[PDB]
Design an enzyme around this catalytic site. Structure first.
Site, PDB file in Angstrom:
ATOM      1  N   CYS A 187      -7.547  -1.347   7.482  1.00  0.00           N
ATOM      2  CA  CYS A 187      -6.416  -1.892   6.743  1.00  0.00           C
ATOM      3  C   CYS A 187      -5.515  -2.715   7.635  1.00  0.00           C
ATOM      4  O   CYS A 187      -5.371  -2.413   8.811  1.00  0.00           O
ATOM      5  CB  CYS A 187      -5.609  -0.760   6.116  1.00  0.00           C
ATOM      6  SG  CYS A 187      -4.114  -1.311   5.284  1.00  0.00           S
ATOM      7  N   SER A 238       0.865  -1.159   0.000  1.00  0.00           N
ATOM      8  CA  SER A 238       0.000   0.000   0.000  1.00  0.00           C
ATOM      9  C   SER A 238       0.907   1.216   0.000  1.00  0.00           C
ATOM     10  O   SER A 238       1.724   1.380   0.907  1.00  0.00           O
ATOM     11  CB  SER A 238      -0.878   0.003   1.246  1.00  0.00           C
ATOM     12  OG  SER A 238      -1.609  -1.203   1.335  1.00  0.00           O
ATOM     13  N   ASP A 271      -8.876  -2.880   3.098  1.00  0.00           N
ATOM     14  CA  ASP A 271      -7.647  -3.151   2.386  1.00  0.00           C
ATOM     15  C   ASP A 271      -6.892  -4.163   3.215  1.00  0.00           C
ATOM     16  O   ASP A 271      -5.862  -3.862   3.817  1.00  0.00           O
ATOM     17  CB  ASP A 271      -6.812  -1.889   2.192  1.00  0.00           C
ATOM     18  CG  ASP A 271      -5.586  -2.148   1.345  1.00  0.00           C
ATOM     19  OD1 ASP A 271      -5.733  -2.847   0.315  1.00  0.00           O
ATOM     20  OD2 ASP A 271      -4.488  -1.665   1.698  1.00  0.00           O
ATOM     21  N   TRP A 321      -5.053  -8.000   3.686  1.00  0.00           N
ATOM     22  CA  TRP A 321      -4.218  -8.924   2.951  1.00  0.00           C
ATOM     23  C   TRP A 321      -3.781 -10.006   3.927  1.00  0.00           C
ATOM     24  O   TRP A 321      -3.620  -9.743   5.119  1.00  0.00           O
ATOM     25  CB  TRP A 321      -3.018  -8.172   2.354  1.00  0.00           C
ATOM     26  CG  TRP A 321      -2.125  -7.429   3.344  1.00  0.00           C
ATOM     27  CD1 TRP A 321      -1.152  -7.974   4.145  1.00  0.00           C
ATOM     28  CD2 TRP A 321      -2.078  -6.009   3.575  1.00  0.00           C
ATOM     29  NE1 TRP A 321      -0.500  -6.980   4.851  1.00  0.00           N
ATOM     30  CE2 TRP A 321      -1.046  -5.769   4.524  1.00  0.00           C
ATOM     31  CE3 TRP A 321      -2.801  -4.920   3.071  1.00  0.00           C
ATOM     32  CZ2 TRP A 321      -0.719  -4.485   4.978  1.00  0.00           C
ATOM     33  CZ3 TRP A 321      -2.474  -3.637   3.524  1.00  0.00           C
ATOM     34  CH2 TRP A 321      -1.438  -3.436   4.471  1.00  0.00           C
TER      35      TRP A 321
HETATM   36  C1  LIG Z   1      -3.173  -5.742  -1.510  1.00  0.00           C
HETATM   37  C2  LIG Z   1      -2.052  -5.990  -0.725  1.00  0.00           C
HETATM   38  C3  LIG Z   1      -1.460  -4.951  -0.016  1.00  0.00           C
HETATM   39  C4  LIG Z   1      -0.369  -5.199   0.809  1.00  0.00           C
HETATM   40  N1  LIG Z   1       0.211  -4.187   1.470  1.00  0.00           N
HETATM   41  C5  LIG Z   1       1.318  -4.410   2.192  1.00  0.00           C
HETATM   42  C6  LIG Z   1       1.927  -3.362   2.872  1.00  0.00           C
HETATM   43  O1  LIG Z   1       1.665  -2.195   2.585  1.00  0.00           O
HETATM   44  N2  LIG Z   1       2.954  -3.631   3.786  1.00  0.00           N
HETATM   45  C7  LIG Z   1       3.381  -4.947   4.001  1.00  0.00           C
HETATM   46  O2  LIG Z   1       4.289  -5.185   4.796  1.00  0.00           O
HETATM   47  N3  LIG Z   1       2.783  -5.992   3.288  1.00  0.00           N
HETATM   48  C8  LIG Z   1       1.753  -5.717   2.381  1.00  0.00           C
HETATM   49  N4  LIG Z   1       1.308  -6.683   1.566  1.00  0.00           N
HETATM   50  C9  LIG Z   1       1.926  -8.028   1.637  1.00  0.00           C
HETATM   51  C10 LIG Z   1       3.044  -8.148   0.596  1.00  0.00           C
HETATM   52  O3  LIG Z   1       2.495  -8.032  -0.718  1.00  0.00           O
HETATM   53  C11 LIG Z   1       3.801  -9.473   0.720  1.00  0.00           C
HETATM   54  O4  LIG Z   1       2.878 -10.565   0.781  1.00  0.00           O
HETATM   55  C12 LIG Z   1       4.684  -9.464   1.971  1.00  0.00           C
HETATM   56  O5  LIG Z   1       5.570  -8.342   1.927  1.00  0.00           O
HETATM   57  C13 LIG Z   1       5.494 -10.761   2.043  1.00  0.00           C
HETATM   58  O6  LIG Z   1       6.128 -10.995   0.782  1.00  0.00           O
HETATM   59  P1  LIG Z   1       7.610 -11.618   0.676  1.00  0.00           P
HETATM   60  O7  LIG Z   1       7.906 -11.805  -0.762  1.00  0.00           O
HETATM   61  O8  LIG Z   1       8.534 -10.795   1.486  1.00  0.00           O
HETATM   62  O9  LIG Z   1       7.461 -13.058   1.382  1.00  0.00           O
HETATM   63  P2  LIG Z   1       6.972 -14.363   0.573  1.00  0.00           P
HETATM   64  O10 LIG Z   1       8.156 -15.022  -0.020  1.00  0.00           O
HETATM   65  O11 LIG Z   1       5.845 -13.978  -0.307  1.00  0.00           O
HETATM   66  O12 LIG Z   1       6.405 -15.296   1.754  1.00  0.00           O
HETATM   67  C14 LIG Z   1       5.155 -14.965   2.363  1.00  0.00           C
HETATM   68  C15 LIG Z   1       4.564 -16.225   2.999  1.00  0.00           C
HETATM   69  O13 LIG Z   1       5.375 -16.687   4.087  1.00  0.00           O
HETATM   70  C16 LIG Z   1       4.507 -17.486   4.910  1.00  0.00           C
HETATM   71  N5  LIG Z   1       4.718 -17.030   6.301  1.00  0.00           N
HETATM   72  C17 LIG Z   1       4.888 -15.634   6.750  1.00  0.00           C
HETATM   73  N6  LIG Z   1       5.233 -15.860   8.169  1.00  0.00           N
HETATM   74  C18 LIG Z   1       5.096 -17.155   8.442  1.00  0.00           C
HETATM   75  C19 LIG Z   1       5.300 -17.803   9.587  1.00  0.00           C
HETATM   76  N7  LIG Z   1       5.743 -17.071  10.606  1.00  0.00           N
HETATM   77  N8  LIG Z   1       5.049 -19.113   9.728  1.00  0.00           N
HETATM   78  C20 LIG Z   1       4.549 -19.826   8.634  1.00  0.00           C
HETATM   79  N9  LIG Z   1       4.344 -19.117   7.446  1.00  0.00           N
HETATM   80  C21 LIG Z   1       4.630 -17.809   7.376  1.00  0.00           C
HETATM   81  C22 LIG Z   1       3.086 -17.202   4.446  1.00  0.00           C
HETATM   82  O14 LIG Z   1       2.649 -18.227   3.542  1.00  0.00           O
HETATM   83  C23 LIG Z   1       3.252 -15.900   3.688  1.00  0.00           C
HETATM   84  O15 LIG Z   1       2.230 -15.798   2.687  1.00  0.00           O
HETATM   85  C24 LIG Z   1       0.177  -6.479   0.875  1.00  0.00           C
HETATM   86  C25 LIG Z   1      -0.424  -7.520   0.177  1.00  0.00           C
HETATM   87  C26 LIG Z   1      -1.538  -7.279  -0.620  1.00  0.00           C
HETATM   88  C27 LIG Z   1      -2.100  -8.321  -1.349  1.00  0.00           C
END
Ligand SMILES: Cc1cc2nc3c(=O)[nH]c(=O)nc-3n(C[C@H](O)[C@H](O)[C@H](O)COP(=O)(O)OP(=O)(O)OC[C@H]3O[C@@H](n4cnc5c(N)ncnc54)[C@H](O)[C@@H]3O)c2cc1C
Ligand SMILES: NC(=O)c1ccc[n+]([C@@H]2O[C@H](COP(=O)([O-])OP(=O)(O)OC[C@H]3O[C@@H](n4cnc5c(N)ncnc54)[C@H](OP(=O)(O)O)[C@@H]3O)[C@@H](O)[C@H]2O)c1
Ligand SMILES: Cc1cc2nc3c(=O)[nH]c(=O)nc-3n(C[C@H](O)[C@H](O)[C@H](O)COP(=O)(O)O)c2cc1C
EC number: 1.6.2.4
Length: 609
Positions: free
Chosen positions: A561, A392, A606, A608
């Protein structure tokens, strides 16, 4: 508006296909299912093909009966407020408008959704219903995949009953087959080799507007600072420069970025497979007819593919492990991998706990099943595509027109698998130093989370933790409006963190805004400063009386949010109780009053996972 391809039915005739599976996908899941169903067709005597509805004109559905044993399947995902995925908006709009007759058309629908949302699987349900109203006949029950439980298992189950039902209806009977062929390139100009770009070759080097998901803008990171005081976790504030990109945005929109996998992880995947990741190659579709010539931009190296084009961290889907089973020299391990596709019994149990619950990524599985040594080229065909991650935008364009702000929490945790998993995008983002200028390929996605058109309308913002991101943009904006002499109504912020000295995001900036009056009220819930929890919904309950006035008489707009539901549902229930008490009314009408505000654009979300 794109240029539609020619009739998909005519294309089915020419290529002798009788089943077509369209996909309404954004993050690529539905596209995955579609492709799997399309490939299944072969084992049941039929021939299928998957396709994007956006590139076609569904009106030709009425011509589908011209093919014997024809069938059409729709794997549709739902997005924000029960809406169609962007690549299915055309189809959705048509369904509503058209009056065409689908007599003779046989269909089935599998919907991808998540129960923690208001309109669960809305898109799937609408397609299923509408096609029937138009005269088409359902050949199998509507499937309801729930991503909050385990979508993969719902697909297996549905799929397992689907084919038998299709075979029985059309009277047909019930093996490793690759989609692409490998072509190693020994002599080849480097200028023809993809290095991570998403669209046209050299699109990352030669940047030319407009910029989008297909042609992302490489914004330079101008700031990357730690937002939290403590060391329990890592919360960061990043500022990307979109100057001279002609990109427009408003507070409430999202910014998407294309990350790069952890290079060490990539190296080990190659190292354990005894492969050379620097070999330049291409995977050409064996089906010379399809428009999808490559699973990802080619020609390129395995290292570039594993780094920018493929997902190597998420738990592999059952079909990928099923195709890998053939490469495990140890019998007992070939059995385990083969059984992962099972719809029940110990096979399903093992998949859900040893793969999913343990969060084992492909490298962990390769390590834990040492006899599994698949050829690298085949593995690249099976792994899903690396997706962009949304954030966001934490800034207002009225104040920072040439800069997009991001507020995020770095993902790092211990998995039952025994290792430390690292979030792809956040680890990559965390390592970007303001500085060879550090660039982030990105693009903006308009959302419907917006500040009220009239500056005088009251704003109530509920955003725990990182859920405050968009509100930093709102506040800057409202602050900006009071500075332009305009009249601004109340602006209330309900924020929550664990402890003021641990992760109180933007503590300094918020204090400012409060002092200069940009924040009528700064209400913060420190969930761990006392023995009992203090959450944002506890503060809303406290200020019920006042919030009721702003809502029922002030025309206030509510915004929620944050991370995915508990929080969002809790809040929602608090607002029900506030309305129910001050209306006064019954709970049932309380729900209705709030539900109405949501449709009347006065209660936005909003959330996620
Ligand atoms: C519409 C929208 C808006 C968003 N806005 C923001 C924002 O503004 N700020 C923000 O920080 N994020 C936000 N996100 C989330 C962001 O897009 C990512 O999903 C997030 O940053 C993690 O992505 P990554 O690639 O770092 O980790 P990834 O490689 O994508 O891994 C994420 C996955 O790790 C797993 N996981 C996380 N912790 C654990 C745990 N402790 N134990 C077991 N499983 C776990 C889950 O399956 C999680 O989905 C938003 C998501 C959406 C869809
Ligand atoms: N969950 C995951 O945690 C990671 C970090 O998320 P984040 O940094 O945005 O938030 P966070 O720091 O986990 O949570 C922010 C605040 O919300 C509180 N909270 C927890 N449950 C809530 C509830 N049900 N109702 C109202 N508030 C609630 C938390 O309190 P406590 O944590 O003290 O309960 C904390 O004070 C993400 O991966 C998210 O998906
Ligand atoms: C911003 C966002 C909004 C969503 N809104 C809904 C929704 O209203 N209803 C629902 O059932 N699922 C909703 N989901 C969940 C998706 O439908 C589910 O994750 C689906 O598996 C995604 O498929 P895809 O990867 O093919 O796009 C949402 C997911 C995101 C990220």
């Amino acid at each position: 508006p794109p240029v539609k391809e020619s009739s998909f039915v005519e294309k089915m005739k020419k290529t002798g296909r009788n089943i077509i599976v369209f996909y309404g996908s954004q993050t690529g899941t539905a596209e995955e299912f579609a492709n799997r169903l399309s490939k299944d067709a072969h084992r049941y005597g039929m021939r299928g093909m998957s396709a994007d509805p956006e590139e076609y004109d569904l009106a030709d559905l009425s011509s589908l009966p011209e093919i014997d044993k024809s069938l059409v399947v729709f794997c549709m995902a739902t997005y924000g407020e029960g809406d169609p995925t962007d690549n299915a908006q055309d189809f959705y709009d048509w369904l509503q408008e058209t009056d065409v007759d689908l007599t003779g058309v046989k269909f089935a629908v599998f919907g991808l959704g998540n129960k923690t949302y208001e309109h669960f699987n809305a898109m799937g349900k609408y397609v299923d219903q509408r096609l029937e109203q138009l005269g088409a006949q359902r050949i199998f029950e509507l499937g309801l995949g729930d991503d909050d439980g385990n979508l993969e298992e719902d697909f297996i189950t549905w799929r397992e009953q689907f084919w038998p039902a299709v075979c029985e209806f059309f009277g047909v009977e019930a093996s490793s087959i690759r989609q692409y062929e490998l072509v190693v390139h020994e002599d080849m100009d480097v200028a023809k080799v993809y290095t991570g770009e998403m669209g046209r070759l050299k699109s990352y080097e030669n940047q030319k507007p407009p910029f989008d998901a297909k042609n992302p803008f490489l914004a330079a990171v101008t700031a990357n600072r730690k937002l939290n005081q403590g060391t329990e976790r890592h919360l960061m504030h990043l500022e990307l420069d979109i100057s001279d990109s002609k990109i427009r945005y408003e507070s409430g929109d999202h910014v998407a970025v294309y990350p790069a996998n952890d290079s060490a992880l990539v190296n080990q995947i190659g190292e354990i497979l005894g492969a050379d990741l620097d070999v330049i190659m291409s995977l050409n579709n064996l089906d010379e007819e399809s428009n999808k010539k490559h699973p990802f931009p080619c020609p390129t190296t395995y290292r570039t593919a594993l780094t920018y084009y493929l997902d190597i961290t998420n738990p592999p889907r059952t079909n990928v492990l099923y195709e890998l089973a053939q490469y495990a020299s140890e019998p007992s391990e070939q059995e385990h991998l083969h059984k992962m596709a099972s719809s029940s019994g110990e096979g399903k149990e093992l998949y859900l706990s040893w793969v999913v619950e343990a969060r084992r990524h492909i490298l962990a599985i390769l390590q834990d099943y040492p006899s599994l040594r698949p050829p690298i080229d085949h593995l690249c065909e099976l792994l899903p595509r690396l997706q962009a991650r949304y954030y966001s935008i934490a800034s207002s364009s009225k104040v920072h027109p040439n800069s997009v702000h991001i507020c995020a929490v770095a993902v790092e945790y211990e998995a039952k698998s025994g290792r430390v998993n690292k979030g792809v995008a956040t680890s990559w983002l965390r390592a970007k130093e303001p500085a060879g200028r550090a660039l982030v390929p990105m693009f903006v996605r308009k959302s419907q989370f917006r500040l009220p058109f009239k500056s005088t309308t009251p704003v109530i913002m509920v955003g725990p933790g990182t859920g405050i991101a968009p509100f930093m943009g709102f506040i800057q904006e409202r602050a900006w409006l009071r500075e332009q002499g305009k009249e601004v109504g109340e602006t209330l912020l309900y924020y929550g963190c664990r402890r003021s000295d641990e992760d109180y995001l933007y503590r300094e900036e918020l204090a400012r805004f409060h002092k200069d009056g940009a924040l009528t009220q700064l209400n913060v819930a420190f969930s761990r400063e006392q023995a009992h929890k203090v959450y944002v919904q506890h503060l809303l309950k406290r200020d019920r009386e006042h919030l009721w006035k702003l809502i029922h008489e002030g025309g206030a707009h509510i915004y929620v949010c944050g991370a995915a539901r508990n929080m969002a549902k809790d809040v929602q229930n608090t607002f029900y109780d506030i309305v129910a008490e001050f209306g006064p009314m019954e709970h049932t009408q309380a729900v209705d009053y709030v539900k109405k505000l949501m449709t009347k654009g006065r209660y936005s979300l909003d959330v996620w996972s």
